[PDB]
Structure 1
């Protein structure tokens, strides 16, 4: 059961694993249908953009301080500084975050 100078392995296959094997044969089909959904969503509301405007936020932790990324929504203070109400902002393609 243990033989030769080999690494000791951890192969977690002692349950009925073969009943829970998900093979992604539909990767290309899902890519194509996802693109079609995206076209339909865009053509429904054109020329209004499909994406809400997102803020830019620093990533948390000491490992990702340096990076900056897209947040979830603009804070109430930020929208206040440009004179937009959050209820109104949500209707002109601007995302709001009451939590930040």
Structure 2
């Protein structure tokens, strides 16, 4: 059973796995269905852009915090800052997320400017039925793409103030480690006299 040097394998096939094997033969078949579903939908949702406009959002989790990402909705405070109501915005194609807030000015002003550019690129048709048709653009994300912000510039000047860039890391890590016991030093001697 164990011989002839080999890495120890962990193959989880001790149950009735053959009864639950799913082979995706319909990968080509379902792809045609999605394109067919997208085509028959767009005719029913005449010339709306087939998707709602979604804001720019910074990811959590520092592995991903350096990137911006398309979010869910335009953050009710942002909708009022753009000059329209939330209930009206949902009928124009502006997705609204009521459960998220704004604690970043750069993200807030980018989303407000995103909404201003959207209202300047739409043709809202009256309820009467005049219909001056405005032949469909199939994507609202390809028209207003998500772009990474420009943090810094290409070239600057060398500013060497003399902090060595590593003692700062060693000191900051040390003062956090010994923060808790040093507040007790200020408490064990404050009670004197």
TM-score (norm 2): 0.51
Give SS of 1:91's match.
helix
Deviations 1:38-95 (A, max 9, x none): 0011111221111100011001101001111100000001001012111111000000
Is residue 99 of structure 1 aligned with residue 99 of structure 2? Answer: yes
Is residue 74 of structure 1 aligned with residue 74 of structure 2? Answer: yes
Q: Where does structure 2 lack aligned partners over 5 or more consecutive residues?
A: 101-193
Q: Which residue of 2 aligns with 1:90?
A: 90
Q: What is the alpha-carbon distance in structure 2 between the residues aligned to residue 62 and residue 47 of structure 1?
A: 40
| Moved segments of 4+, more than 4 Å | none
Q: Where does structure 1 lack aligned partners over 5 or more consecutive residues?
A: none
Deviations 1:3-33 (A, max 9, x none): 1110000000000000000000000000001
Q: Map 1:1-100 onto structure 2 (within 5 A).
A: 1-100=1-100
Q: Which residue of 1 aligns with 2:145?
A: none
Give the number of the structure whose alpha-carbon radius of gyration is greater: 2
Q: What is the alpha-carbon distance in structure 2 between the residues aligned to residue 20 and residue 73 of structure 1?
A: 38
TM-score (norm 1): 0.97
Q: What is the alpha-carbon distance in structure 2 between the residues aligned to residue 13 and residue 48 of structure 1?
A: 49
Give SS of 1:78's match.
helix
